[PDB]
Amino acid sequence: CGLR
Amino acid sequence: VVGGTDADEGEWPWQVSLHALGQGHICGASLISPNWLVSAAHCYIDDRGFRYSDPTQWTAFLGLHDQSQRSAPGVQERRLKRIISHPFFNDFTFDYDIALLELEKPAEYSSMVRPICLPDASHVFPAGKAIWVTGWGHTQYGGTGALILQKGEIRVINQTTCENLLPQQITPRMMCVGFLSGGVDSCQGDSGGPLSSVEADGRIFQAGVVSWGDGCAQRNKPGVYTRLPLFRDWIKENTGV
Ligand SMILES: N=C(N)c1cccc(COc2cc(OCc3cccc(C(=N)N)c3)cc(C(=O)N[C@H]3CC[C@H](N)CC3)c2)c1
Missing domain, CATH: 2.40.10.10 (Trypsin-like serine proteases)
Structure with missing residues (x-):
């Protein structure tokens, strides 16, 4: 979750 | 914006576009797991010309960048099977303005799609x-x-x-x-x-x-x-x-  | x-x-890559059948983009949502989105309860209210509360009426586009390019590589398209509006959602004030949307099948994690x-x-x-x-x-x-x-x-x-x-x-x-x-x-x-x-x-x-x-x-x-x-x-x- 929460990055690229 | x-x-x-x-x-x-x-x-x-958590940003999702919700289209209502025949009306294009209506609201945003966020990907939070393979099968679930968070959105605003107010997007899912019926009016006299359209059952915005009915999950069959919707399409979620994950990994979307350009509204004119919904079929680009990496864009996933999904139906909803369920809209859970917060039971305390208030029509008039927008108190408890939150919904959970269940994808009809799971999102596939990728570099464009991520919770x-x-x-x-x-x-x-x-x-x-x-x-x-x-x-x-x-x-x-x-x-x-x-x-x-x-x-x-x-x-x-x-x-x-x-x-x-x-x-x-x-x-x-x-x-x-x-x-x-x-x-x-x-x-x-x-x-x-x-x-x-x-x-x-x-x-x-x-x-x-x-x-x-x-x-x-x-x-x-x-x-x-x-x-x-x-x-x-x-x-x-x-x-x-
Ligand atoms: N600047 C911003 N940050 C911003 C961000 C997003 C949106 C917006 C504006 O868009 C609005 C706003 C809206 O507000 C009603 C209200 C809800 C609480 C509070 C006050 C208030 N002035 N205190 C007003 C309802 C609607 C709407 O969709 N009504 C449908 C409900 C179902 C009906 N049958 C059909 C219409 C759209 C602004």
Whole structure:
């Protein structure tokens, strides 16, 4: 979750 | 989003576009697990010409960048099987303005499609903190949606300030985020999309749901958002996530  | 810039392709891979059958883009949502989205309850209300509360009426596009290019590589298209509106959602005030949407089959994680982190119940996003609002909504008040996803940087506003700015309208489920001086704001069509907050190790957590505002970008009228930490257990209860 929460990055690229 | 008023006063924003184009996102880079894949920059907000939790950002989802909800289309209502035959009407194109209506609201935003956030990916939070392989089978679940968070959005605003108000997007899912019937009116006399269209059952916006009916999950069969909707299409979720994950990994979307350009509304004119919904079939680009990496874009996933999904149906909903269920819309759970918060039981305390208030029609008139937009109190409890949050919905959970169940995808009809699971999202496939990729570099364009990835869930947002959810904040624990006791986490507080502090007054002053920079965070990002994204969407394809109006880039001006009374103005036209964006084809290319927009991002704008805004700031959490002190709750007392927020309440005073918008009297008898702000509940503790609500949070003002934006600028007293205007300029940058969410707007119509951004509804239901996530606030993204960069946290201590660079991971992005959801700080709110785009809910309502008076116009967009106006002086002393910051956009109003449904808080997330307060709904952490409700989300766990209802989705397993
Ligand atoms: N600047 C911003 N940050 C911003 C961000 C996003 C959106 C917006 C504006 O878009 C709005 C706003 C809206 O607000 C109603 C209200 C809800 C609480 C509060 C006050 C208030 N002035 N205190 C108003 C309802 C609707 C709407 O969709 N009504 C449908 C409901 C179902 C009906 N059958 C058909 C219509 C759209 C602004």
